[PDB]
Write an enzyme that holds these catalytic residues in place. Structure first.
Site, PDB file in Angstrom:
ATOM      1  N   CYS A 164       0.863  -1.251   0.007  1.00 20.52           N
ATOM      2  CA  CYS A 164       0.065  -0.137  -0.045  1.00 20.52           C
ATOM      3  C   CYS A 164       0.877   1.279  -0.062  1.00 20.52           C
ATOM      4  O   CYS A 164       0.326   2.328  -0.231  1.00 20.52           O
ATOM      5  CB  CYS A 164      -0.966   0.056   1.126  1.00 20.52           C
ATOM      6  SG  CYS A 164      -0.759  -1.117   2.343  1.00 20.52           S
ATOM      7  N   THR A 270       1.862  -6.458  10.712  1.00 18.57           N
ATOM      8  CA  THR A 270       0.341  -5.845  10.527  1.00 18.57           C
ATOM      9  C   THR A 270      -0.025  -4.768  11.492  1.00 18.57           C
ATOM     10  O   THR A 270      -0.672  -3.859  10.938  1.00 18.57           O
ATOM     11  CB  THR A 270      -0.517  -6.971   9.917  1.00 18.57           C
ATOM     12  OG1 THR A 270      -0.765  -7.976  11.083  1.00 18.57           O
ATOM     13  CG2 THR A 270      -0.147  -7.708   8.682  1.00 18.57           C
ATOM     14  N   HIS A 301      -5.315   7.678   5.215  1.00 18.05           N
ATOM     15  CA  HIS A 301      -5.114   6.446   4.946  1.00 18.05           C
ATOM     16  C   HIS A 301      -6.633   5.725   4.731  1.00 18.05           C
ATOM     17  O   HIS A 301      -7.097   5.214   4.168  1.00 18.05           O
ATOM     18  CB  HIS A 301      -4.254   5.639   5.416  1.00 18.05           C
ATOM     19  CG  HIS A 301      -3.665   4.564   4.873  1.00 18.05           C
ATOM     20  ND1 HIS A 301      -3.419   4.408   3.436  1.00 18.05           N
ATOM     21  CD2 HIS A 301      -3.479   2.991   5.133  1.00 18.05           C
ATOM     22  CE1 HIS A 301      -2.947   3.163   3.317  1.00 18.05           C
ATOM     23  NE2 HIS A 301      -3.202   2.181   4.286  1.00 18.05           N
ATOM     24  N   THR A 305     -10.143  -0.502   8.887  1.00 13.53           N
ATOM     25  CA  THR A 305     -10.087  -1.956   9.941  1.00 13.53           C
ATOM     26  C   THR A 305     -10.157  -1.327  11.071  1.00 13.53           C
ATOM     27  O   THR A 305     -10.200  -0.040  11.491  1.00 13.53           O
ATOM     28  CB  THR A 305      -8.383  -2.364   9.689  1.00 13.53           C
ATOM     29  OG1 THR A 305      -7.430  -1.444   9.797  1.00 13.53           O
ATOM     30  CG2 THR A 305      -8.264  -2.843   8.097  1.00 13.53           C
ATOM     31  N   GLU A 312      -4.293   5.198  13.356  1.00 11.86           N
ATOM     32  CA  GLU A 312      -4.181   6.393  12.629  1.00 11.86           C
ATOM     33  C   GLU A 312      -4.739   7.682  13.151  1.00 11.86           C
ATOM     34  O   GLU A 312      -4.203   8.917  13.216  1.00 11.86           O
ATOM     35  CB  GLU A 312      -4.653   6.422  11.123  1.00 11.86           C
ATOM     36  CG  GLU A 312      -4.857   7.413  10.249  1.00 11.86           C
ATOM     37  CD  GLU A 312      -5.104   7.390   8.681  1.00 11.86           C
ATOM     38  OE1 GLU A 312      -6.042   6.211   8.452  1.00 11.86           O
ATOM     39  OE2 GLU A 312      -4.672   8.123   8.031  1.00 11.86           O
ATOM     40  N   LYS A 330     -10.860   5.871   0.734  1.00 14.58           N
ATOM     41  CA  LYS A 330     -11.309   4.795   0.701  1.00 14.58           C
ATOM     42  C   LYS A 330     -12.679   4.231   0.909  1.00 14.58           C
ATOM     43  O   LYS A 330     -13.205   3.240   0.504  1.00 14.58           O
ATOM     44  CB  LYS A 330     -10.521   3.940   1.596  1.00 14.58           C
ATOM     45  CG  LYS A 330      -8.934   4.174   1.340  1.00 14.58           C
ATOM     46  CD  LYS A 330      -7.829   3.112   1.943  1.00 14.58           C
ATOM     47  CE  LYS A 330      -6.475   3.323   1.660  1.00 14.58           C
ATOM     48  NZ  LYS A 330      -5.738   4.705   1.620  1.00 14.58           N
ATOM     49  N   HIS A 335      -9.936   0.268  -0.849  1.00 16.55           N
ATOM     50  CA  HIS A 335      -8.253   0.391  -0.378  1.00 16.55           C
ATOM     51  C   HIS A 335      -7.865  -0.200  -1.643  1.00 16.55           C
ATOM     52  O   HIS A 335      -7.927  -1.491  -2.044  1.00 16.55           O
ATOM     53  CB  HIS A 335      -8.089  -0.664   0.892  1.00 16.55           C
ATOM     54  CG  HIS A 335      -6.494  -0.447   1.099  1.00 16.55           C
ATOM     55  ND1 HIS A 335      -5.698   0.020   0.139  1.00 16.55           N
ATOM     56  CD2 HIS A 335      -6.033  -0.968   2.090  1.00 16.55           C
ATOM     57  CE1 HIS A 335      -4.249  -0.038   0.870  1.00 16.55           C
ATOM     58  NE2 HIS A 335      -4.663  -0.516   2.136  1.00 16.55           N
ATOM     59  N   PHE A 395       1.540  -2.154   5.229  1.00 14.66           N
ATOM     60  CA  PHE A 395       2.349  -3.592   5.458  1.00 14.66           C
ATOM     61  C   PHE A 395       3.850  -3.307   6.001  1.00 14.66           C
ATOM     62  O   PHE A 395       4.444  -2.714   5.322  1.00 14.66           O
ATOM     63  CB  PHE A 395       2.119  -4.524   4.260  1.00 14.66           C
ATOM     64  CG  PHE A 395       1.727  -5.864   4.531  1.00 14.66           C
ATOM     65  CD1 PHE A 395       0.526  -6.093   4.759  1.00 14.66           C
ATOM     66  CD2 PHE A 395       2.669  -6.786   4.455  1.00 14.66           C
ATOM     67  CE1 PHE A 395       0.150  -7.508   4.970  1.00 14.66           C
ATOM     68  CE2 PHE A 395       2.330  -8.201   5.109  1.00 14.66           C
ATOM     69  CZ  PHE A 395       1.152  -8.354   5.421  1.00 14.66           C
TER      70      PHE A 395
END
Ligand SMILES: [Ca+2]
Lengths: 408, 409
Positions: A164, A270, A301, A305, A312, A330, A335, A395
């Site tokens: 990403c 992750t 971003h 999730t 964030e 998004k 995404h 990631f």
């Protein structure tokens, strides 16, 4: 040190290619998420959601000698870059291939066909579909090379395939290449092609939304009822250009890039770490010699999730305080993985130019686990920015922050 | 106010071993590391049965499971290389490197075999039996870079340089520019590759592989009139790059200084190289180092032993330096180590420079007249006392790199 401006923007996205089409779609407030019944083919995917491109029209004039090396992700990248070059005024330019335009690009993955072919070669030894073109379609740098070769460019290739972070590192590292005098111009972007395996990456982490009957209602960045991301696809390219050069040819200048910060959490593969995410933003502010107070808007971003959105929000609140307007594109296109940093940078500049900032779609109750920020929602916000920031967190805990300066 | 950049750690995992003394003895003993690969009879359509594998590899015993889940072989090679280089640089057990001051530049031509098999089969049949939550991180383009960075909890920038054959040299070059430019104080830079059938198919399908399947000791043959292609190898190599004052202030042993990096592309063909732009990459490095061609005492060729590759490279080198330039190819010993090649070759080139001792190209007995006249070292090692050396690499997509290292006497 040279200054660096953006004189071309373009891409292929779930909302279209031209900004005017995209603006209308943003304004109409429906996302590009759909059911994916064909994924019943796959043994164990929970999600049946994605935000695909509404088809992809491969231009007729593209020569076989060049397209043999391209799967979809490279076709997207090339098409994006073609649009951006036109927009920059370089359609038919004879000079850009002389070694002083380079390419920064990447993707999370190569193309499906050769992954299938090489994988089956391992599985059974069969090589039926393994050809001399399979590697260049699969390779980590398929996007960057295919874009560069397509215009016979002879500059440096900076292969930013970092899942990403691909598109934002492309922009950032291209920016530093121009600033430090290595290249006069750079095509910089990211791309991704939708596939089952691309979705499995996140589905096996339980990071995917499984509201398989309600595609219009998911994903939901920063929302209390969110249950994961939705994968998308496409590509976007920016034409970055040294400032005097752009001035000298009377280019229309979309923005100036004034800061880029990049670091890693060094903690989880992750699970994102807020402090180091914040540090990426600070690095960008330091690079731009700006106070946090200078930033009028953050393009999140905003993956939707559980942990991603919380971490964030905290990173952003830490850098800026509760006053910062923020939204996640998004919520519209999902995404878009490899493409996300480039597509989001592009759209963030388009919004900045027009004093018009899209809300996060499907954000009706701000999750109380998320830090208080000025979450734009319900309606677009009118802001008149001198500077905007676009962040991405990837990631391996790879973090990027980009700061763009208004150009009137 | 650009920073100078020096190399304070070198290490890797190679067909000739890890320690330089062990590798020197092998180079001296003049046998290559090429072997017949009977296992490749498993594959439907490979013509070659040659490779230069690692003779073995086992994970260090003290690597914790929690850290190794995300690694296939190539990432294990990369981490081991980087571990050796860090020790050599004096950073073993030193946790301050994790504070954001050190970053990572790394890449490979490909991820690991297992998840490629797993995901490829998912496409082939829909089966997801062996697709796990760890498959992507072992397969991903940046598997090497992320695994190395994570392993020491590093918090600096990750520069993914996965560009097939150019992976290791772009890592070194772009890490170099990051330190010069003040973005990072330190960088691990390297490249890696794991040997697999598919990795060989990449070149075998181009007819670029040697098929002298009964004579592994006699192939590959860079610049030789009787050469018939490359041989694929594997491994990894890492250099620790470090800002100069920082190195001096902690009393580091300094192996070399990096003084130039040139990087461009041919913009012509995907596999066939173009000599003029290969030369231009060398010029770019010379210009970056503010040196005349005359300053370079030796070139470490890419020297893959392909038909067109060797011709183009020779012409490019003659064009830049004239006929006098001493040159040789370490791929004559370890084969074409792909992702690893730019890093391994940089490392060994610095080791040779430090010792005034330059290995000949193995199995070069008649210089191909289609190659440009150069001073092709062969038969015996050459003693040269270099103030500067150059190491070149030319890759898929016409990606060219040229690195210049300065002697530190
Ligand atoms: Ca110009």
């Amino acid at each position: 040190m040279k200054r660096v401006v953006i004189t071309g923007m373009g891409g292929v996205t779930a909302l279209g290619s031209r900004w005017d089409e995209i603006e209308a779609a943003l304004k109409a407030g429906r996302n590009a998420v759909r059911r994916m019944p064909d994924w019943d083919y796959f043994e164990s995917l929970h999600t049946r959601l994605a935000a695909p491109l509404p088809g992809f029209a491969q231009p007729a004039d593209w020569p076989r000698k060049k397209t043999r090396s391209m799967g979809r992700v490279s076709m997207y990248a090339v098409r994006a870059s073609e649009l951006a070059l036109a927009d920059a005024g370089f359609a038919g330019d004879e000079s850009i291939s002389d070694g002083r335009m380079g390419v920064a690009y990447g993707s999370s993955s190569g193309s499906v066909e050769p992954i299938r072919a090489f994988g089956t070669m391992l599985e059974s030894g069969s090589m039926t579909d393994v050809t001399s073109n399979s590697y260049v379609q699969m390779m980590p740098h398929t996007t960057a090379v295919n874009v560069s070769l397509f215009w016979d460019l002879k500059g440096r290739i900076v292969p930013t395939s970092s899942a990403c972070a691909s598109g934002s590192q492309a922009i950032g590292y291209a920016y530093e290449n121009i600033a430090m005098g290595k290249q006069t111009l750079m095509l910089a972007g990211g791309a991704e092609e939708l596939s089952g395996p691309a979705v499995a990456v996140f589905d096996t982490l339980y990071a995917t939304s499984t509201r398989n009957d309600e595609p219009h209602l998911t994903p939901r960045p920063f929302d209390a009822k969110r249950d994961g991301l939705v994968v998308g696809e496409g590509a976007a390219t920016l034409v970055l250009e040294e400032y005097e050069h752009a001035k000298a040819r009377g280019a229309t200048i979309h923005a100036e890039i004034v800061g880029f910060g990049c670091n890693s959490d060094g903690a989880h593969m992750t699970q994102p770490t807020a402090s180091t995410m914040a540090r990426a933003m600070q690095l960008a502010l330091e690079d731009a010699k700006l106070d946090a107070n200078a930033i009028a808007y953050v393009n999140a971003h905003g993956t939707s999730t559980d942990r991603g959105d919380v971490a964030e929000s905290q990173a952003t609140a830490r850098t800026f305080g509760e006053r910062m307007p923020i939204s996640s594109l998004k919520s519209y296109v999902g995404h878009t993985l490899g493409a996300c940093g480039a597509l989001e940078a592009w759209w963030t500049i388009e919004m900045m130019k027009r004093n018009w900032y899209a809300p996060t779609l499907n954000l009706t109750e701000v999750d109380p686990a998320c830090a208080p920020l000025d979450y734009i929602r319900g309606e677009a916000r009118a802001i008149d920015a001198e500077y905007v920031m676009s962040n991405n967190f990837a990631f391996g805990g790879i973090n990027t922050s980009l700061i763009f300066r208004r150009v009137r």
